[PDB]
Amino acid sequence: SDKIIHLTDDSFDTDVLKADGAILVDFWAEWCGPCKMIAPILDEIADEYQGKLTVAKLNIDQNPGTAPKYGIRGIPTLLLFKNGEVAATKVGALSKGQLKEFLDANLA
Template sequence: MPKPYPARYRANPNRKGKIMSSELIVHTGDAAFEQDVLKSDLPVLLDFWAPWCGPCKMIAPILDDIAAEFEGRLKVVKINIDDNEATPSRFGVRGIPTLMVFKNGDVVATKVGALAKGQLTAFVEASIA
């Protein structure tokens, strides 16, 4: 039997129906994508992921760190590609994890595959500058 996820990765019932990886990460879906990502006042780092994806699990704690480090300057959002097929299709996602940075509703940078924290930090800093 698999171990349960640590408490910080479980659903938080106090967050208006959104499932959170941490208090700073928003999980979105096809229906809420426009509001959560395209209409965001802050730049958005969007993670296309799936629960069965090993590299996605590897970068999850790094995304938590990025969300904390860039709080107030960047919004970190995750979308499960198994539960939401329209958005990955719309943006041509072919592999996961795929990370995209959005500014003012437009994709300004994309990376496919797991990144180390230093690489992800540099990617974000260059993308939101």
């Protein structure tokens, strides 16, 4: 895909909690049409912000355990982990512009 980490509950700790940078964890599901629809945007963003931001796409169907942990009651969820610190959590799709702005504002 791109600079998109297909995380698992098991890898979550080492990858996200110990993120050597900023990791945007997108919580998605096989049935999540909208998640797929934003995937190109996430890919583009992941490329654009390479070195500043890293992106991940965690499948809750495969990893149910991770959903409760971050109160994933709706997807696509976008949780921005700055070195494991959840800086911001967005729920639902948004425009590339909004996403870029959000990311810029959080990264600062």
